[PDB]
Amino acid sequence: KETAAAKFERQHMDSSTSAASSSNYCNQMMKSRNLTKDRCKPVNTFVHESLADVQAVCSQKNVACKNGQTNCYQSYSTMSITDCRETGSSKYPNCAYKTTQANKHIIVACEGNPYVPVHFDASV
């Protein structure tokens, strides 16, 4: 099956754009990355940086994850991110999202060898 690392890339990486460019970004991306296949995922974050810069976070500031696990890492620098949140008119299979563009530090959980991001925890 799809690896955790690959799933992280599919769910969270968009190195092809520097920022969301319109209000329809989330609607398009949530669908195209297959995040609405079985149900409307209620929230998701896309990161507009190189994969290498995001992988590098696993060697940055170790912090506790929201759930208490201690394999989380916070980026030293802010990154370009897009937050997608389900709107009131969202109804499967026509999932609908509000797009919010921001520059924040990211917190990811890392696993494996190579040690890479497998979960997006938070932006701060």
Tab-separated table of C-alpha atoms in Angstrom:
chain	number	residue	atom	x	y	z
A	1	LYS	CA	0.000	0.000	0.000
A	2	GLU	CA	0.866	3.691	-0.075
A	3	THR	CA	3.550	4.468	2.499
A	4	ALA	CA	3.035	6.986	5.293
A	5	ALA	CA	5.707	9.206	3.729
A	6	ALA	CA	4.021	9.125	0.317
A	7	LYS	CA	0.660	9.830	1.909
A	8	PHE	CA	2.143	12.890	3.618
A	9	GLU	CA	3.360	14.201	0.251
A	10	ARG	CA	-0.012	13.574	-1.390
A	11	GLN	CA	-2.005	15.130	1.427
A	12	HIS	CA	0.209	18.065	2.338
A	13	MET	CA	2.788	19.085	-0.255
A	14	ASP	CA	2.298	21.570	-3.069
A	15	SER	CA	5.721	22.644	-4.279
A	16	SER	CA	4.226	23.661	-7.653
A	17	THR	CA	2.687	26.901	-6.408
A	18	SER	CA	4.024	29.546	-4.040
A	19	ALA	CA	0.639	30.301	-2.503
A	20	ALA	CA	-3.057	29.709	-3.119
A	21	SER	CA	-4.060	32.031	-5.960
A	22	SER	CA	-7.844	31.960	-5.698
A	23	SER	CA	-10.702	31.017	-3.416
A	24	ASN	CA	-11.124	27.756	-5.348
A	25	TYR	CA	-7.658	26.402	-4.502
A	26	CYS	CA	-8.840	24.122	-1.707
A	27	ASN	CA	-11.852	22.814	-3.622
A	28	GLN	CA	-9.600	21.852	-6.513
A	29	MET	CA	-6.733	20.419	-4.475
A	30	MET	CA	-8.783	18.420	-1.991
A	31	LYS	CA	-10.480	16.711	-4.922
A	32	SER	CA	-7.384	16.234	-7.086
A	33	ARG	CA	-5.309	14.719	-4.267
A	34	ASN	CA	-8.117	12.220	-3.581
A	35	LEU	CA	-8.831	13.537	-0.080
A	36	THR	CA	-12.596	13.593	-0.679
A	37	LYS	CA	-12.910	10.107	-2.174
A	38	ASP	CA	-14.621	8.366	0.748
A	39	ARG	CA	-15.813	11.363	2.784
A	40	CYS	CA	-15.189	15.098	3.057
A	41	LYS	CA	-12.020	15.446	5.124
A	42	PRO	CA	-12.911	18.423	7.343
A	43	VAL	CA	-9.544	20.175	7.533
A	44	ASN	CA	-6.265	19.952	5.692
A	45	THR	CA	-3.119	22.014	5.218
A	46	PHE	CA	-0.969	22.285	2.099
A	47	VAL	CA	2.642	23.447	2.296
A	48	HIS	CA	4.133	25.527	-0.544
A	49	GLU	CA	7.805	24.711	-0.066
A	50	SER	CA	10.299	22.272	-1.525
A	51	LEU	CA	9.993	18.709	-0.274
A	52	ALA	CA	13.600	18.883	0.938
A	53	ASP	CA	12.882	21.918	3.141
A	54	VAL	CA	9.907	20.158	4.727
A	55	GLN	CA	11.835	16.892	5.221
A	56	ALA	CA	14.525	18.960	6.938
A	57	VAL	CA	12.076	19.861	9.700
A	58	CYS	CA	12.660	16.386	11.184
A	59	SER	CA	16.115	17.622	12.213
A	60	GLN	CA	14.884	20.899	13.691
A	61	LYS	CA	13.152	21.760	17.005
A	62	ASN	CA	11.827	18.667	18.810
A	63	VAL	CA	8.487	19.374	20.503
A	64	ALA	CA	5.503	17.428	21.810
A	65	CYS	CA	2.699	16.735	19.342
A	66	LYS	CA	-0.802	17.884	20.222
A	67	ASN	CA	-1.597	14.345	21.388
A	68	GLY	CA	1.473	14.113	23.614
A	69	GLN	CA	3.775	12.058	21.369
A	70	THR	CA	7.347	13.274	21.333
A	71	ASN	CA	8.331	12.600	17.720
A	72	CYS	CA	7.142	16.028	16.551
A	73	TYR	CA	9.317	18.809	15.168
A	74	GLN	CA	8.720	22.509	14.657
A	75	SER	CA	10.246	24.369	11.717
A	76	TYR	CA	12.760	27.080	12.606
A	77	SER	CA	11.388	29.249	9.810
A	78	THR	CA	7.902	30.208	8.727
A	79	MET	CA	6.585	28.544	5.604
A	80	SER	CA	3.926	29.355	3.043
A	81	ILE	CA	0.832	27.302	3.835
A	82	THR	CA	-2.777	27.046	2.788
A	83	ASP	CA	-5.416	26.016	5.296
A	84	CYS	CA	-8.523	24.307	3.914
A	85	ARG	CA	-11.611	24.068	6.095
A	86	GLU	CA	-14.974	22.590	5.198
A	87	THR	CA	-17.753	25.154	4.689
A	88	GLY	CA	-21.373	25.024	5.765
A	89	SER	CA	-22.482	24.149	2.231
A	90	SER	CA	-20.216	21.135	1.966
A	91	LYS	CA	-22.120	17.936	1.273
A	92	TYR	CA	-20.535	14.694	0.096
A	93	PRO	CA	-19.623	14.064	-2.655
A	94	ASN	CA	-19.631	17.793	-3.359
A	95	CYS	CA	-17.179	18.730	-0.638
A	96	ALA	CA	-16.576	22.449	-0.276
A	97	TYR	CA	-13.760	24.330	1.438
A	98	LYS	CA	-12.715	27.789	2.505
A	99	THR	CA	-9.154	28.671	1.454
A	100	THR	CA	-6.913	30.638	3.830
A	101	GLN	CA	-3.349	31.557	2.892
A	102	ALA	CA	-0.822	32.121	5.667
A	103	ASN	CA	2.839	32.105	6.649
A	104	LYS	CA	3.421	30.011	9.750
A	105	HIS	CA	5.782	27.578	11.395
A	106	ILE	CA	4.786	23.979	10.833
A	107	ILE	CA	4.858	21.047	13.228
A	108	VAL	CA	5.149	17.563	11.776
A	109	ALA	CA	5.591	14.081	13.210
A	110	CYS	CA	8.536	12.105	11.832
A	111	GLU	CA	9.204	8.371	11.543
A	112	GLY	CA	11.413	5.884	9.777
A	113	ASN	CA	14.832	5.600	8.186
A	114	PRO	CA	15.258	7.917	6.392
A	115	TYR	CA	13.531	9.929	9.130
A	116	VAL	CA	10.771	11.822	7.317
A	117	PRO	CA	7.470	13.605	7.956
A	118	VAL	CA	4.460	11.294	8.151
A	119	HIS	CA	1.847	13.493	9.859
A	120	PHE	CA	0.984	17.190	9.832
A	121	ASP	CA	0.315	18.217	13.427
A	122	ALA	CA	-0.215	21.974	13.503
A	123	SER	CA	0.789	25.401	12.255
A	124	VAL	CA	1.795	28.056	14.773
